[PDB]
Amino acid sequence: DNFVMPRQRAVTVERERQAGKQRDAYYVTQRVNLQRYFANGVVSGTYAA
Amino acid sequence: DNFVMPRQRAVTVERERQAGKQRDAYYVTQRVNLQRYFANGVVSGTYAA
């Protein structure tokens, strides 16, 4: 419950014909981060040094 | 009366969505000069040196 994925855009595929290279260029962008509402909330385990 | 602004194009705006870079570019271009029909006609006053 402490973690939220702040969004803002979702996978946007944008294709631009880039003639002159006779190519079609597809670009996909997304802006997402994991965040945590409050500092606490995860414990990780580690193999021992 | 001696000066005319020779035109040829006036301020126009062209938006060119450039996907693949995800920008939208506004290129505004214009073409004009200030020219005098005959050389006479301007006196400028100058601060002294």
UniProtKB/Swiss-Prot annotation, chains A, B:
Compartments (UniProt record): Virion
Interval of the full protein contained in this chain: 409 to 457 of 458
Subunit structure: Interacts with the decoration protein; each hexon binds a single copy of the decoration protein. Interacts with the portal protein.
Source organism: Escherichia phage T5 (Enterobacteria phage T5)
Function: Major capsid protein that self-associates to form 120 hexamers and 11 pentamers, building the T=13 icosahedral capsid which about 860 Angstroms in diameter. Responsible for its self-assembly into a procapsid. The phage does not need to encode a separate scaffolfing protein because its capsid protein contains the delta domain that carries that function. The capsid gains its final stability through the reorganization of the subunits that takes place upon expansion. DNA encapsidation through the portal triggers capsid expansion and the binding of the decoration protein to the capsid exterior.
Top-level taxon in the UniProt lineage: Viruses
Protein name (record): Major capsid protein
